[PDB]
Write an enzyme that holds these catalytic residues in place. Structure first.
Site, PDB file in Angstrom:
ATOM      1  N   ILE A 118       1.454 -11.839  -4.669  1.00  0.00           N
ATOM      2  CA  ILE A 118       1.863 -11.082  -3.494  1.00  0.00           C
ATOM      3  C   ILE A 118       0.723 -11.072  -2.494  1.00  0.00           C
ATOM      4  CG2 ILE A 118       2.364  -8.792  -2.567  1.00  0.00           C
ATOM      5  CD1 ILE A 118       4.087  -8.376  -5.136  1.00  0.00           C
ATOM      6  N   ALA A 122      -8.286  -4.978  -2.665  1.00  0.00           N
ATOM      7  CA  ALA A 122      -9.714  -4.744  -2.449  1.00  0.00           C
ATOM      8  C   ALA A 122     -10.560  -5.147  -3.663  1.00  0.00           C
ATOM      9  CB  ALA A 122      -9.960  -3.285  -2.098  1.00  0.00           C
ATOM     10  N   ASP A 156      -7.104   7.784   4.351  1.00  0.00           N
ATOM     11  CA  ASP A 156      -6.997   6.395   4.835  1.00  0.00           C
ATOM     12  C   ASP A 156      -5.555   6.008   5.059  1.00  0.00           C
ATOM     13  OD1 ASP A 156      -8.145   3.961   5.791  1.00  0.00           O
ATOM     14  OD2 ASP A 156      -8.158   3.144   3.748  1.00  0.00           O
TER      15      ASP A 156
END
Ligand SMILES: Nc1ncnc2c1ncn2[C@@H]1O[C@H](COP(=O)(O)OP(=O)(O)NP(=O)(O)O)[C@@H](O)[C@H]1O
Ligand SMILES: [Mg+2]
EC number: 2.7.11.24
Length: 347
Positions: free
Chosen positions: A21, A25, A139
């Protein structure tokens, strides 16, 4: 003994038939067939153990996501790792397979006002739960909002999430910050560590703007430019709002700038629903004390089709960390990660 674009993606026999996909990180994200539940799932390979920051983010996310249970927050279905600490090099997090994320969607698709309204509702519904647990996501951005083919939305990526700590929010002018620039509230650059719930509401307001136009509203090229963008639209802060900033250095910086008048929202977003713009205004309010809170936002007329506080659940108790993860070495964090993921072992 199962490979994808090399590295190893060894997710026992339970999960087979992998497909790339994307790149996370700390490793690859793949879809896989779940031979037990007979549905396809997403699996994130995390190899965090060589950096303490990676370990912190990994531990936060696991601890929080295992504790939270909400329709608009991605769940952890399974975690795969080796049976001993010695042998554990990677950790695999298994989740419901979502089709896309809002970042990928906004690259090519215009949203109808109905889609904007429903996606906003679901963001805020999830956020009410997170805030009710005394947690800040910190975030929020389009790529941390997962979407499936039936327009269900789930907030993901709690690697920067913290417990709210308004009493310790104050800092000096131009204090460095970690979360994504474009979605940072103005106070982050002025006097705030981002330890209050209002920082999340700013991010959602930026997301709403971005849903309305398919482009980031405040695309700063660097730390201080981000503030320039924000002030270019909101205009100069009022005297009352400046008086709320006691930080001399931050106040004097704002006083040094030429006067700028507000750019009206309907100039910036001429096709937008008027009620959407009224809610946008309240989320993108400069003074974090005047900024709308999550429950008020849910009650805003824009969201009247969906608002139902009895169907907007809260957490059963505040979330707390046993210990502070910033002060913990690489090795102890590995240890905690092993213990947190123990429930998923056949064992
Ligand atoms: N459950 C899922 N289904 C489909 N794609 C996902 C899923 N979880 C994550 N992804 C994709 O992988 C990206 C990275 O995941 P995220 O949980 O944000 O962790 P990060 O690597 O810290 N950033 C997302 O922005 C998605 O496109
Ligand atoms: Mg992410």
């Amino acid at each position: 003994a199962a490979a994808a674009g090399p590295q190893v993606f060894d997710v026992g026999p339970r999960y087979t038939n992998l497909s790339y996909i994307g790149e996370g990180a700390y490793g690859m994200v793949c879809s896989a067939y779940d031979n037990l539940n007979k549905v396809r799932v997403a699996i994130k390979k995390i190899s965090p153990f060589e950096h303490q920051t990676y370990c912190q983010s990994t531990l936060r996310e696991i601890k929080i996501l295992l504790r939270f249970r909400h329709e608009n927050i991605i769940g952890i279905n399974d975690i795969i790792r080796a049976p001993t600490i010695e042998q554990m090099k990677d950790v695999y997090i298994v989740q419901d397979l979502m089709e896309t994320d809002l970042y990928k969607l906004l690259k090519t698709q215009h949203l109808s006002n109905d889609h904007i309204c429903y996606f906003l509702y679901q963001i805020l519904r999830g956020l009410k739960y997170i805030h009710s647990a005394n947690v800040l996501h910190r975030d929020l951005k389009p790529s941390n909002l997962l979407l499936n083919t039936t327009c269900d939305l789930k907030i993901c990526d709690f690697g920067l999430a913290r417990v709210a700590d308004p009493d310790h929010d104050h800092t000096g002018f131009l204090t460095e910050y970690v979360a994504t620039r474009w979605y940072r509230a103005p106070e982050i650059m002025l006097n705030s560590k981002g330890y209050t719930k209002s920082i999340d509401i700013w991010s959602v307001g930026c997301i709403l703007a971005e849903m309305l136009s398919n482009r980031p509203i405040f695309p700063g090229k660097h730390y201080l430019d981000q503030l320039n963008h924000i002030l270019g639209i909101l205009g100069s802060p009022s005297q009352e709002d400046l008086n709320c900033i006691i930080n001399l250095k931050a106040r004097n910086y704002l006083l040094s700038l030429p006067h700028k008048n507000k750019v009206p929202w309907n100039r910036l977003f001429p096709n937008a629903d008027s009620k959407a713009l009224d809610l946008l205004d309240k989320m993108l309010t400069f003074n974090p004390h005047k900024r709308i809170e999550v429950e008020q936002a849910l009650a805003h007329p824009y969201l009247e089709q969906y608002y139902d506080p009895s169907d907007e659940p809260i957490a059963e108790a505040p979330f707390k960390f046993d210990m502070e993860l910033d002060d913990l070495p690489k090795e102890k964090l590995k240890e905690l990660i092993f213990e947190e993921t123990a429930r998923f072992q056949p064992g």
